[PDB]
Enzyme design. Sequence first.
Site, PDB file in Angstrom:
ATOM      1  N   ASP A 192     105.631  12.919   0.936  1.00 52.59           N
ATOM      2  CA  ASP A 192     106.814  12.465   1.659  1.00 52.59           C
ATOM      3  C   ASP A 192     107.594  13.644   2.206  1.00 52.59           C
ATOM      4  O   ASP A 192     107.954  13.661   3.428  1.00 52.59           O
ATOM      5  CB  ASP A 192     107.706  11.585   0.715  1.00 52.59           C
ATOM      6  N   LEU A 199     114.044  12.007   5.425  1.00 50.72           N
ATOM      7  CA  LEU A 199     114.668  10.675   5.562  1.00 50.72           C
ATOM      8  C   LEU A 199     114.226   9.765   4.438  1.00 50.72           C
ATOM      9  O   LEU A 199     113.041   9.742   4.073  1.00 50.72           O
ATOM     10  CB  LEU A 199     114.338  10.016   6.901  1.00 50.72           C
ATOM     11  N   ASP A 229     105.268  11.328  15.212  1.00 53.68           N
ATOM     12  CA  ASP A 229     105.019  12.614  14.564  1.00 53.68           C
ATOM     13  C   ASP A 229     104.885  12.373  13.055  1.00 53.68           C
ATOM     14  O   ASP A 229     105.650  11.586  12.481  1.00 53.68           O
ATOM     15  CB  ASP A 229     106.248  13.458  14.786  1.00 53.68           C
ATOM     16  N   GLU A 259     100.199  10.579  14.603  1.00 60.01           N
ATOM     17  CA  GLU A 259      99.576  11.817  14.124  1.00 60.01           C
ATOM     18  C   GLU A 259      99.461  11.710  12.581  1.00 60.01           C
ATOM     19  O   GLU A 259     100.434  11.996  11.878  1.00 60.01           O
ATOM     20  CB  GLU A 259     100.437  13.036  14.486  1.00 60.01           C
ATOM     21  N   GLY A 298      75.565  28.239  16.720  1.00 59.03           N
ATOM     22  CA  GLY A 298      74.350  27.431  16.924  1.00 59.03           C
ATOM     23  C   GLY A 298      73.824  26.637  15.713  1.00 59.03           C
ATOM     24  O   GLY A 298      73.019  25.709  15.846  1.00 59.03           O
ATOM     25  N   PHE A 300      75.382  24.635  13.668  1.00 55.63           N
ATOM     26  CA  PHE A 300      75.934  23.306  13.448  1.00 55.63           C
ATOM     27  C   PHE A 300      74.897  22.228  13.808  1.00 55.63           C
ATOM     28  O   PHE A 300      74.184  22.343  14.816  1.00 55.63           O
ATOM     29  CB  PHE A 300      77.197  23.112  14.286  1.00 55.63           C
ATOM     30  N   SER A 401      69.363  18.875  16.712  1.00 55.31           N
ATOM     31  CA  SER A 401      70.448  19.626  16.105  1.00 55.31           C
ATOM     32  C   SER A 401      71.157  20.620  17.050  1.00 55.31           C
ATOM     33  O   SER A 401      72.219  21.164  16.690  1.00 55.31           O
ATOM     34  CB  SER A 401      69.932  20.304  14.865  1.00 55.31           C
ATOM     35  N   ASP A 425      74.736  23.306  21.449  1.00 50.28           N
ATOM     36  CA  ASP A 425      75.392  24.447  20.777  1.00 50.28           C
ATOM     37  C   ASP A 425      74.433  25.640  20.638  1.00 50.28           C
ATOM     38  O   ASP A 425      74.752  26.604  19.945  1.00 50.28           O
ATOM     39  CB  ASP A 425      76.007  24.066  19.402  1.00 50.28           C
TER      40      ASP A 425
END
Length: 479
Positions: A192, A199, A229, A259, A298, A300, A401, A425
């Site tokens: 929180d 708030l 937000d 968000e 590469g 990934f 891949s 990639d």
Amino acid sequence: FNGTMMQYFEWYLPDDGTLWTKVANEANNLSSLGITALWLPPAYKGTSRSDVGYGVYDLYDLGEFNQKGTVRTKYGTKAQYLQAIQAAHAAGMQVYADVVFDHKGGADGTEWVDAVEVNPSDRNQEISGTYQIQAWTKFDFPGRGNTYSSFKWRWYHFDGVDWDESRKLSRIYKFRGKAWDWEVDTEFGNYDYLMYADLDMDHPEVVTELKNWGKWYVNTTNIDGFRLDAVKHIKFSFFPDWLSYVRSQTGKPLFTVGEYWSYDINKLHNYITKTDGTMSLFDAPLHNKFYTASKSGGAFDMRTLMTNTLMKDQPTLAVTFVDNHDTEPGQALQSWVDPWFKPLAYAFILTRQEGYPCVFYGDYYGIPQYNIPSLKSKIDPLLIARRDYAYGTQHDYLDHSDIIGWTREGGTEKPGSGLAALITDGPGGSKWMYVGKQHAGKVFYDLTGNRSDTVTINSDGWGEFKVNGGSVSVWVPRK
Ligand SMILES: [Ca+2]
Ligand SMILES: [Ca+2]
Ligand SMILES: [Ca+2]
Ligand SMILES: [Cl-]
Ligand SMILES: [Cl-]
Ligand code: NA
Ligand code: NA
Ligand code: NA
């Protein structure tokens, strides 16, 4: 026409009060590229003129009152804001306004409040005895007076603060008799609390006031929706209640994106369940995927690029993005996608049918603060792809891949549309993909200009599409 959002600011904009003017000036240009909605930064008075807007002081001061040492906000005056929104509307674009309800900073005065310190790493654990502090909780808005709203804020509208003015101590203080709201995110026990005066969403005067402000703000500014937000830090059941009120009272659908910053996909599914699908969420886990892929040299596994993301799991509630003001260098959520990978991530979110994509102002115009050049010349051809070609049935080829791709067959009422996209990639190569039998014999070219060859569709509707190393091609039919 596909929906395409743009986040129309970045963190390191100069404090020169020009952003609202830029919106009005650029609106037509943006709309012509198929942008349909702008997310604008918080437009109300922060703790100082140069606050990006999350240090919210007065929700009712839109750069209109002499408060916190300025009249205008970082972005301009109330009139320039209203004019920005009108200009977007004339260009045929909607405006989503940033809403900051988590905390409130820059109080006009202090109040003596009995409080206890809690652990920043575990806000359910008290780490002092009760003692009396001087908290920045008194908001009277002497620059505005009672224009628009006579509501005054006091200690009891808040669950706690981060500063004792009497002993000059930085601590997370929970006020005695107050509890952290529930449900919220459970990182650090209860997330929180975030900054300034937090708030208390269980206080009825707070709930009523924010409802009052929500209706006033929509009616006053003529906005079309909201970016919320810090929603993981705000009681989950508050926003369904707030939105139902503001939507009914204004008669507008008010598209809303929250968000919820987490890379844990299950936390996002939890939030969506607990809010009954009343809002979309930013696909933060897909942002993490892009970041990770960009840095992996590469290695990934591109077959996993959308695994455990909102784009895959809940596409109608996903707002997809490559980077934002928090992921920029030097910022709180820093996780900046390297420029080599960035057009590939843009092509992924702009040409696929899943999700509602969001272009980042800092990518599009550059970030002079870090000497980051504009990527407008690489992003524009992908905006055109979305605007003109990214229509109809999708076929997926997330099957290697490095080199992955997908096609769009084109829409039965958007003539000339259709595409085949490839990104990699690693080394480049080719991939046979189905674009539609109806395209048999057509010649396709690479709308990015990264490649100069062409691909002719065979009699079965298959083309052998190609892509360079570490690159993207977006193949579309000649007219
Ligand atoms: Ca509370
Ligand atoms: Ca909070
Ligand atoms: Ca790879
Ligand atoms: Cl304990
Ligand atoms: Cl408690
Ligand atoms: Na605990
Ligand atoms: Na709270
Ligand atoms: Na935030």
